[PDB]
Write a protein that binds this ligand. Sequence first.
Ligand SMILES: Cc1cc2nc3c(=O)[nH]c(=O)nc-3n(C[C@H](O)[C@H](O)[C@H](O)COP(=O)(O)O)c2cc1C
Ligand SMILES: Cc1cc2nc3c(=O)[nH]c(=O)nc-3n(C[C@H](O)[C@H](O)[C@H](O)COP(=O)(O)O)c2cc1C
Ligand code: NA
Ligand code: NA
Lengths: 179, 179
Amino acid sequence: NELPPENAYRILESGPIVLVSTRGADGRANLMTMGFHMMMQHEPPLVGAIIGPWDYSHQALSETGECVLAVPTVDLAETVVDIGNCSGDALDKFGHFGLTPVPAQTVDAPLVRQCWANLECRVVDDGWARRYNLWVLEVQRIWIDTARKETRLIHHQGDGRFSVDGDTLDLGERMTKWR
Amino acid sequence: NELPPENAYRILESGPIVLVSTRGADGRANLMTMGFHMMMQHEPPLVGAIIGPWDYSHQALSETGECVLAVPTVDLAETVVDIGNCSGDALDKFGHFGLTPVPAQTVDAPLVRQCWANLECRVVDDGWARRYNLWVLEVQRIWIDTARKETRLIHHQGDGRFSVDGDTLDLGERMTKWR
Ligand SMILES: Cc1cc2nc3c(=O)[nH]c(=O)nc-3n(C[C@H](O)[C@H](O)[C@H](O)COP(=O)(O)O)c2cc1C
Ligand SMILES: Cc1cc2nc3c(=O)[nH]c(=O)nc-3n(C[C@H](O)[C@H](O)[C@H](O)COP(=O)(O)O)c2cc1C
Ligand code: NA
Ligand code: NA
């Protein structure tokens, strides 16, 4: 199922841990794990992402200007941590971790089938990439696995500790300024 | 209880909704609600924050270069939403909502007694404030209410819907790259 990209805040504002899927100029796919990210703007949908030169993935991001933010659920927690503790420079992470790359619509980086949400992104502003390792991304497309049985997101609290989403609390009726 | 400011990630990486406390040049305290933020750097501890001109609080941020990020818990959810739907141009929100200002150590913006964590911040880089309403903050001090019984954080999913923290996973043993 597809969501309009303006819906990005509804997926990312809450600060889930995410995977960043890339594909190098060489055609090889990779994954890394990212907890330093923000929504920047609702419409157009802009995301701020920290991806530094300590990541092999930084090369593909730099060179190609594309990625997919693949949003995992609680059942993938060990895979997500492990992805964040090894490098794709010499390991096939999709293969190793039993994840399935799926073609994206607007980018050459793959979607991750096992992730509940996949947000196709382009690098729109690299102005602060050198300064802060900050990349401004615009969400192009959003794909949701609406059939998925487990849908709880997890959030990194540092040091490999994660909160698992529990109760949902809907205070929409109080959002009088934001209709 | 005080934490070294380098600990900021352990508070903010998970993407809790936060209150932004300011004090204007005229001496009036205020609060606003913010969901568009991220950690940018562990050490020195840098935070990226979206605070736009639609917020009265933008004036104090510009004019004083100081704030406190006050991190609420689930028991404050309605108040957090309400704070985000009115303006301090014409209201004393601390008084109106029954929150208590406490003097900070390094800034003139107050801490919020009822919030679990309070991170004193200075604006270090306003280079992208006009561009994106983005402010780079450096955490100066961290205070934690270590006695508080309710400590579950809430995460905004947009439109006044929040996830409430559930269980914590501790996968620290797997953080082999990040000791
Ligand atoms: C939970 C967690 C969060 C992470 N957050 C970030 C991040 O925000 N930015 C970043 O550049 N690296 C982050 N990392 C580190 C990268 O995921 C890690 O360096 C990874 O091994 C890079 O893979 P690569 O070399 O294949 O690109 C994180 C790791 C973990 C486990
Ligand atoms: C849950 C929620 C999240 C919000 N996130 C942001 C944000 O990230 N940045 C922002 O500038 N305003 C945000 N707002 C809007 C401000 O909180 C709102 O405009 C507030 O009335 C400003 O108060 P002030 O005029 O006293 O500064 C948010 C509001 C709510 C309720
Ligand atoms: Na292409
Ligand atoms: Na965030």
